[PDB]
Design a protein around this ligand. Structure first.
Ligand SMILES: Nc1ncnc2c1ncn2[C@@H]1O[C@H](COP(=O)(O)OP(=O)(O)OP(=O)(O)O)[C@@H](O)[C@H]1O
Ligand SMILES: [Ca+2]
Ligand SMILES: [Zn+2]
Lengths: 424, 149
């Protein structure tokens, strides 16, 4: 009800650097469309932007400004449309219910196949359904509910994220959208083709839990090195198999259990000897010597067999196989260090000008004040939206300069490593 | 322990963790990212479930396990999907080589020998060498993080 309070809440300020390299303060009225921006998108932009070579995030922020503007427009339209708003707001609920349904269907399938908080209450309902209707009918009802909820969830997802806004091609391009469509296809296959197809849905745990995704990132980030190490292991196995075929052929006797002799030779061809070595020596802790025939001391080839087994054990089992685990362990530390550095920068540096906290010590304006009022990335975004919306004729002095710089793709109007308060 | 049974005193031996800061710090490596460890275990369970589905569908006959009877010597362990899941989780995970150890040794003349070889090697690499080692990697990373802090 206070006019001054309303105007203060709807007024914003920024600091710009002019062509003469002097700083000025521009006070502008916040554009109306700015209020529609989502806190989720704001947090994602704050925590996801990456520094450039020079160490400034301003370039990427300016690049994403246009997507932010389009998102604001579609937020206004979505709030205009009532019914879809209710579904869009409760996006998390649909995902949680779908995950619980997938877990329950998979549990039932595992426990009964082949056949013929409100979570405890839902479990009791499922148990009563099993007791009354039967395992098959309960599974059918659960699958139908899962499919309906997944349709609701995909509609809510497209509504909330506005992927289509970029275009149909962009919507198809989005990987998360494709993951959701794959989930829908898997649910349909589970409902109609075969019940065991519901198993694939259990992979949604990786998507849901960030921690599990971070754990798998250790495998995936440097995965090329792991595959190359596996190829090295294959090469060494091939060479060992060549040696065994040439000299130690007879020792390759492997016990066999036959469906309706008790041993068979496994190194009569080089392909077979390679298969035997790769399948058995690698999996066995000791190595290929474990499967190979036990050598009597009186035999002349015992010294060669000892060296063969020990060399395989040390080269392949002890060194090569451990290199994959070493790669995973190193990837863990690399990810941890990168995360720590990014968190430190985000917490202790200004997004726009990049000045450190220590620079503001023993000064009239704190770093918190600087980020909140003097340098607010959202205030800069609001100013950009103001320049876009406002007619060219009504541009003021500073607005004309900012518009020309935007058109020329010059990002020097942002303040870099400079603040008016620190200067004076 | 005093009033019910003498074996209840065994639980008191856990006071060593309370007494010693060193052992408590060592266990803190397991506990700090216990959620990560449990999520990795759940991923292992899901992969075992999928492997059991595949084995039940195509490699059912190979699931023959020996048994000792208190007063035949082999029983089928993949007649039902729960039985197959229990067999895989209990034996393949604990065995160094994976499920191939428990599974029947295939003859080369058998048509499904390549399929069995791929099955065993895939289980070994995906589960035994990667998924299981991720828990130890998590523990080591927790060690490092605690040291840095
Ligand atoms: N340049 C910047 N450097 C560092 N942090 C920033 C910067 N600009 C904004 N932030 C932080 O981003 C978050 C978003 O700030 P915002 O103005 O939306 O705060 P709010 O308290 O939600 O808003 P309001 O008080 O106006 O309702 C806040 O943590 C703010 O400190
Ligand atoms: Ca004018
Ligand atoms: Zn600043």
């Amino acid at each position: 009800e206070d006019p001054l309070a309303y105007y203060e809440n709807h007024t914003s300020q920024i600091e710009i650097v002019r062509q003469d390299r002097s700083m000025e303060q521009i006070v502008f009225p916040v554009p109306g469309i700015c209020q529609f921006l989502t806190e989720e998108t704001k947090h994602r932009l704050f925590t996801t932007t990456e520094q450039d070579e020079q160490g400034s995030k301003v370039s990427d922020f300016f690049d994403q400004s246009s997507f932010l503007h389009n998102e604001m427009e579609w937020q206004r339209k979505l709030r205009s449309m009532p019914l879809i708003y209710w579904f869009s707001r409760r996006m998390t609920l649909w995902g949680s219910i779908s995950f619980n349904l997938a877990v329950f269907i998979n549990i039932i399938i595992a426990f009964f196949y082949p056949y013929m908080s409100i979570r405890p209450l839902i479990v009791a309902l499922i148990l009563r359904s099993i007791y009354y209707l039967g395992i098959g009918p309960t599974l059918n009802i659960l699958g139908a509910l899962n499919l309906t909820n997944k349709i609701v969830f995909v509609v809510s997802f497209v509504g909330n994220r506005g992927t289509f806004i970029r275009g149909y091609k962009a919507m198809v391009m989005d990987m998360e959208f494709l993951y959701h469509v794959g989930y829908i296809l898997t649910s349909v296959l589970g409902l109609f083709a075969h019940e065991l197809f519901y198993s694939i849905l259990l992979f949604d745990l990786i998507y849901r839990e960030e921690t599990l995704f971070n754990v798998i990132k250790s495998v995936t980030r440097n995965g090329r090195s792991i595959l190359l190490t596996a190829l090295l292991a294959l090469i060494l196995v091939y060479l060992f198999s060549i040696v065994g075929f040439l000299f130690l052929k007879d020792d390759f006797i492997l016990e066999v259990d036959r469906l309706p002799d008790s041993t068979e030779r496994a190194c009569d061809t080089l392909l077979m000897c390679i298969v035997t070595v790769m399948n058995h020596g690698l999996r066995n802790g000791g190595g290929v010597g474990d499967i190979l025939r036990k050598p009597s001391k009186d035999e002349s080839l015992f010294p060669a067999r000892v060296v063969y087994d020990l060399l395989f054990f040390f080269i392949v089992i002890i060194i090569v196989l451990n290199l994959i685990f070493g790669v995973i362990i190193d990837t863990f530390a690399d990810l941890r260090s990168e995360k720590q550095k990014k968190e430190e920068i985000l917490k202790t540096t200004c997004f726009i000008c990049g000045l450190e906290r220590d620079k503001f010590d023993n000064k009239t304006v704190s770093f918190e004040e600087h980020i909140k009022l003097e340098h607010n990335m959202w205030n800069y975004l609001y100013f950009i939206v103001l320049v876009r919306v406002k007619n060219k004729t009504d541009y003021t002095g500073p607005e004309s300069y900012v518009a020309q710089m935007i058109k020329n793709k010059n990002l020097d109007w942002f303040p870099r490593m400079r603040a008016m308060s620190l200067v004076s």
